[PDB]
Amino acid sequence: PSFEETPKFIEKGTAPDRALPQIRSAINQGVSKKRDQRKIFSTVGIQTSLASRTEFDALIRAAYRQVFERDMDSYRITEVFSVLETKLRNREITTKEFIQALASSDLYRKQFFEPYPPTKNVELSLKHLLGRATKDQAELRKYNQIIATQGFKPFINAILDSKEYGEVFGDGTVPYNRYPTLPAANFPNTEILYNQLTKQSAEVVVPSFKPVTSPRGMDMSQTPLMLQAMGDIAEAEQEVALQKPLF
């Protein structure tokens, strides 16, 4: 006979049985595959405009698709930004200034600033320029104040001159969806924003953040650690009483 038992490492790696509904769900469960099935466009070459022309035009059109969410050929976007493209080919400016000129353009303002309230403006421009939704209440306050007091272009430049843009995208890469893991609620809000087609909805995804200043109940004064604290302060008070004269 020479019975040959099934090796243990076979069963150590077996999966539960799964029909088609569970197989489909198991394939598509975690973070969306768009996170890795994508290209990131950066001006890796400092070479002249004469060579690598096609790569550089691909970068330009990727920047258009990132700032305006799609191709804007009907709006003759190429001739509007012709001088800008010429400067970026001649390496007079970097990718970040190209993005700054597209995001501060009149076309961008008509597409994403004029149609929406300032909160939606903050979240849309943060999606287009930082790759994420509005992060917390402090960021909403900061950009709301800029929009209220200085308007649209200082708002765009405040986003683009922030340290976060410099750390993530620097001066050479076109922005992209970041799939941010931190902080809390950034990931789902960002996914909601980036799973939306252009003009899919006019609703504000993140109107504001509900304050955590006051909860209802759970004073935490009954906590046994705090109870021990009130126990020990009593002993301290008793000692202070004892250092008084006995009479």
Binding site: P7, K8, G13, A62
Partner: protein, 160 residues
């Protein structure tokens, strides 16, 4: 996959696949049967490969299966050889896919953090993968050995 990679590249550019990418897909599709034969050959002899790779590894690194080692005991050695089985399956997946994308997406991204949480030696993983490469490329011919060792080399470089 080559087809997936070309389609992703074309879609990131909002264009149709150029004649160059279609020629790449042509070449990939033509070589499909040979790669399928290599993957079938690896699949038919998985138990032999895993057992021999484990024997070579534990001869080379007896500490892992000595008491106090990571893979000491029948169950832990079973888990070790199960890891090797996982990576052999990913090697066959990459062979049919034509690139290291299955290996990278399943067993490479975050492998160091995972094995650090498992207190599993990364060098030992490297010798285990090298043993797998030797045993598997032994079964193949001269031409197929280079292609399969490419995937094994990528995975071993990913480990350390």
């Amino acid at each position: 996959s080559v087809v997936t990679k070309a389609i992703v590249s074309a879609d990131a550019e909002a264009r149709y696949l150029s004649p160059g990418e279609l020629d790449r897909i042509r070449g990939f599709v033509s070589s499909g049967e040979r790669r399928l034969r290599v993957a079938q050959t690896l699949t038919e002899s998985r138990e032999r490969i895993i057992k021999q790779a484990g024997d070579q590894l534990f001869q080379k690194r007896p500490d892992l299966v000595s008491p106090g080692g990571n893979a000491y005991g029948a169950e832990r050695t079973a888990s070790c050889l199960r890891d090797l089985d996982y990576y052999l399956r990913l090697v066959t997946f990459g062979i049919v896919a034509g690139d290291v994308t299955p290996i990278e997406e399943i067993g490479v991204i975050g492998v160091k953090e995972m094995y650090r949480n498992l207190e599993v030696p990364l060098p030992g993983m490297v010798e285990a993968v090298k043993a797998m490469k030797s045993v598997a490329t032994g079964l193949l011919s001269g031409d197929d050995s280079a292609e399969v060792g490419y995937y094994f080399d990528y995975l071993a470089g990913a480990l350390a």
